[PDB]
Amino acid sequence: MLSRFLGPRYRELARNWIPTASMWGAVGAVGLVWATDWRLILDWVPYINGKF
């Protein structure tokens, strides 16, 4: 577990899934911002800050 998952093929799989996982995290961040109506972030995007 501490070494079975630490392998060159496993590291390559991590690199393969870095874009997908990272932009999934971006998906989650943007969804959280939209759902909570986070003003601290939404105050900067144009045409959306007019809502407040």
Binding site: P8, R9, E12, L13, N16, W17, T20
Partner: protein, 445 residues
């Protein structure tokens, strides 16, 4: 002597061409035997609806009789020298090859000239041959792999000549008379679309002068002006299910539109295919087989035999898999098999790519063993590619591909593409087409 050094030796495929256009190509290595045959560019894809099956009739009646050689005298001469004369006809190419000794080359070329130029096409022999072809259709009805592949082509290339069966519907075979066959011979068996290929103890100069003195009468003129043109086909992602619950096993073949003959993406894709590999119940590798799907199938006794194909025509081709398994195994494989493709489209590793490269190299080298497979290679490559690709070029293109290339090409051809499922037999658990198309993409990605 290393792999690269042995690869270079590779006696060349010296290629020439007469005035008519019949390309002459030979390959001398050592043997006292030689395979000599012509690879015409006929086939089912050049046959219209009314005359479909003409090529099969012509191939059937080729050896029966000629004008110069009255009949069974042809077979007597072929057997008296020990030659194993054979022929075949796919959807694209039709070929006859005398497979005999080197010393019998002058007579062997003469025999092929008679078959491919002066065919009696006798009406009586046509009528006797008519029943045989109908019998052969009843033969092929039993063979489940052949019928499932015919269903594949019918449901994938629907509305195009490619979807037509090579043998033809069992209605044209009962109406094709001498007139249709003679038109087929005089309109497809033309010198430009012919490759006189020989391999073994054959001299290129000898093959050239034999061709000059025999096949000179071949013409390239297309009657008044009727020139059959190559017609692009339309891969129509569809499905067909001939459900017959009395059959023991359920042959299921699923494919998507792969590349054409000339497309370089063939070299990476085969590697990807080699990663999935092929399995049969009588293998013995079992759970330890490198291929993920092979190990899964052997561990759980899922299927009886799955194998991947790379059917490749001129402008398009089929790419996928064909598995034979019991009734309560069809769905699971269609989950695992697709689970492989998407993984290959998203998580290809260096190790499996190296394995696929080695498998492809071994397949290419092993298939090119013996005079007849070399003759096959020359005849097919001079038509599909326009030249015979040397093994060194194959090695270079294989060395080019890597994990990134495999992932890119699989995403280009496999990911989110409508398949062409075609089943047969006790296909109940067979997932609905919407389920298959949904499985053609991965929500994590």
């Amino acid at each position: 002597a290393t792999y690269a050094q042995a690869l270079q030796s590779v006696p060349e495929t010296q290629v020439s061409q007469l005035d008519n256009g019949l390309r002459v190509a030979s390959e001398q290595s050592s043997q006292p035997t030689c395979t000599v045959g012509v690879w015409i560019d006929a086939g089912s894809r050049y046959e219209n609806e009314k005359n479909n099956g003409a090529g099969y009739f012509v191939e059937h009646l080729a050896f029966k009789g000629t004008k110069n050689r009255p009949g069974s005298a042809l077979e007597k001469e072929v057997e008296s020298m020990g030659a194993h004369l054979n022929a075949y006809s796919t959807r694209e190419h039709t070929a006859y090859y005398i497979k005999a000794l080197s010393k019998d080359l002058p007579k062997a070329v003469e025999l092929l000239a008679d078959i491919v130029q002066n065919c009696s096409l006798e009406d009586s022999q046509i009528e006797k041959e008519r029943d045989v072809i109908l019998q052969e259709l009843q033969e092929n009805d039993s063979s489940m792999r052949d019928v499932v592949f015919d269903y594949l082509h019918a449901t994938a290339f629907q509305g195009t000549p490619l979807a037509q069966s090579v043998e033809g519907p069992s209605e044209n075979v009962r109406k094709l008379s001498r007139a249709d066959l003679t038109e087929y011979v005089s309109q497809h068996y033309k010198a430009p679309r012919m490759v006189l290929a020989a391999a073994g103890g054959v001299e290129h100069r000898q093959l050239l002068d034999l061709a000059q003195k025999h096949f000179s009468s071949l013409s390239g003129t297309y009657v008044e002006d009727a020139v059959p043109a190559f017609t692009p086909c339309r891969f129509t992602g569809s499905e067909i299910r001939h459900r017959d619950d009395a059959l023991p096993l359920a042959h299921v073949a699923i494919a998507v539109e792969g590349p054409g003959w000339a497309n370089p993406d063939n070299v990476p894709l085969q590697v990807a295919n080699a990663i999935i590999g092929h399995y049969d119940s009588t293998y013995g590798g079992g759970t330890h087989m490198s291929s993920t799907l092979a190990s899964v199938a052997a561990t759980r006794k899922l299927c009886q035999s799955f194998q991947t194909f790379n059917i490749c025509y001129a402008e398009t081709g089929l790419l996928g898999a064909h598995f034979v398994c019991d009734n309560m195994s069809i769905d699971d494989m269609m989950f695992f098999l697709q689970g492989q493709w998407m993984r290959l489209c998203t998580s290809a590793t260096e190790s499996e790519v190296v394995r696929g490269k080695n498998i492809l190299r071994n397949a290419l080298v092993s298939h090119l063993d013996g005079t007849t497979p070399v003759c096959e290679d020359i005849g097919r490559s001079l038509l599909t590619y326009g030249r015979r690709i040397p093994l060194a070029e194959w090695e270079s293109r294989i060395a080019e591909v890597d994990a990134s290339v495999v992932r890119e090409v699989c995403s280009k051809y496999f990911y989110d593409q409508c398949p062409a499922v075609a089943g047969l037999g006790p296909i109940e658990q067979l997932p609905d087409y919407n389920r298959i198309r949904s499985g053609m993409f991965w929500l994590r990605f």
